[PDB]
């Protein structure tokens, strides 16, 4: 039985970490499984969005310290912890139950959107063990929540309850306990209903603009805009809207 | 009757999009009218602040798709949608009633401050039509509200209610329905009461610092600081404060 | 009696501006005193965290305008207002009571974390006197709170009440009036309990990553990570955790 489970529902790829006895800690198998799933997402024209979740009601306790201690290839060159150093092109939603800690919070941060149960919690407690959250936690958390709160969490290693995380803008959708995945599917379906080229281009511009200067951002953006505006889907979108009916996207 | 109306009240320029039957959608006339108004604002020494609003109780439904479809010069080279690619030097407040959607939200984002009615709403639904919000929406929204919420709005095309937008920091002032312009005038008057050179320099530093490195930001800032500190208004400000009375600014 | 008081409590350096009759305004003596305290913090292996506070129930009214007017060396080359242009390496918490205005807000912004009394207030009213908040206020406030609110505060010179500042993410901890320092000590103790090399490295990555590109951030981060992961404290942290007891850090 695979330690990462994958199920396709229409155009949504549901990815489930399947090590509940190990609190879904990331070992070599999970790291590879996550990378393979992201490859599948981006490579399959029939997929639009992925959801990442942890089986059994707990998202991810972080990297498997035992697996790490004994030489498992957990942090993979070019990919990081599963995909922390190589986020997918298509949208990724993290559906969080229970604890998303350390590497677990870093997986969530590598996703684009977070749906979290009201009783879930985040955190990067690495400094408590004289270590540092090097899987993107320090690079992404201050960009997702207010800088000083990210600093506080990083220096103290305190847990961040989901409801506070929603107040701070880290969590998009608060769900009833046990229903985060269903809430995430609803979110995914809203995104898969939109133009696939436009959705991917939109994510691309938001992510890449972080590295653009104010003086160049519009010209850099234009290069991404043109293939969308001349696509078949751009025509179909205009036709469908004018005819008040659902657009039939082709991703071309 | 002009499709963009302009009224000067003391040192405040009130700019009103005047196409209520077209939901104040931006066509060629409105685009040019907005650009002319911003030129007027920045060029007139007797003006300190502008307010942009949509006549009739709805801010702006976005770009006029019909005007666009039939070849109106709506997105002007060097300026964008009115002024989206050329924001004014002096402060601009958007006073939002009803819907500010797509290009309408992009106009608001190109302003510095937003006053919005409690029953108003924002959004960038471009992906629903297989298009992308290329008028600065994707470049500015993630800088105004938490990154993940900006991502969510961009990928889903969902409306953002004004009250939520205030929670997220996009909206400065929530106003009673129908009173956004009056609230905006109150805000504008607070700013026009302050030193005009200092106000413009302050905006300049906040906007331009986005493109400065940590190692250079103070030296870059200094170049903007010096002309302010040696201005006539700097002297007048100190004198007025010491004498507990209103400063008589000259903008020199 | 020194105009800046310094007390060591275990590994915490408590720094108190001691000019209550002058609302703890920063003159030459206070500027130098603050710089010396930060040097002490960073230079002493027995110190982990500092707390900055204003004696008597008011944080800092800003730069001493009288001292400034008559030629005191208040803004020191290479350091700024005390330390605004040279923030410490180790974590700094500002414990705010009463008013932190102008230069006072800039001192707080140069700290990493802010604990503020529920009845305290911030602000950068420089534009009211035809001046500009050049001590880092304009460079840091838009990075700590939502951009548009930072713009609003900078252009209006309005006070920012502590409770609103907490909503916006500027204030980490809201304290009962008169108890901000005790709340700050609790926060400091949480941080001093964590691995000193890991804490300093964590702060370093969060602060320096502001000037890194997305394409280089992980490689830049790695250089800071390696000395932490190979430290004696990394070993001790792992041992202590496995033995369910407190780690005895050495800062090596």
From TrEMBL, chains A, B, C:
Q: Which reaction does it catalyse?
A: (22E)-3-oxochola-4,22-dien-24-oyl-CoA + H2O = (22R)-hydroxy-3-oxo-chol-4-ene-24-oyl-CoA; a (3S)-3-hydroxyacyl-CoA = a (2E)-enoyl-CoA + H2O; a 4-saturated-(3S)-3-hydroxyacyl-CoA = a (3E)-enoyl-CoA + H2O
- Domain of life here? Bacteria
SUPFAM superfamilies annotated for this entry?
A: ClpP/crotonase
Which pathway features in its UniProt record?
Steroid metabolism; cholesterol degradation
Q: Which Gene3D superfamilies match?
A: 2-enoyl-CoA Hydratase, Chain A, domain 1, Lyase 2-enoyl-coa Hydratase, Chain A, domain 2
Give any single GO term for biological process: cholesterol metabolic process
Keywords per UniProt = Cholesterol metabolism, Fatty acid metabolism, Lipid metabolism, Lyase, Steroid metabolism, Sterol metabolism
Keyword Cell membrane listed? The answer is no
Q: CDD domains given for it?
A: crotonase-like
The entry lists its GO molecular-function terms as: enoyl-CoA hydratase activity
Oligomer and partners: Homotrimer; substrate probably binds in elongated tunnels between the subunits.
Against NCBIfam families, the record matches this protein to: PRK08252.1
Q: Could you tell me what this protein does? A: Could possibly oxidize fatty acids using specific components.
Record protein name field: Enoyl-CoA hydratase EchA19
Q: Name the source organism.
A: Mycobacterium tuberculosis (strain ATCC 25618 / H37Rv)
Gene symbol of the encoding locus:
echA1
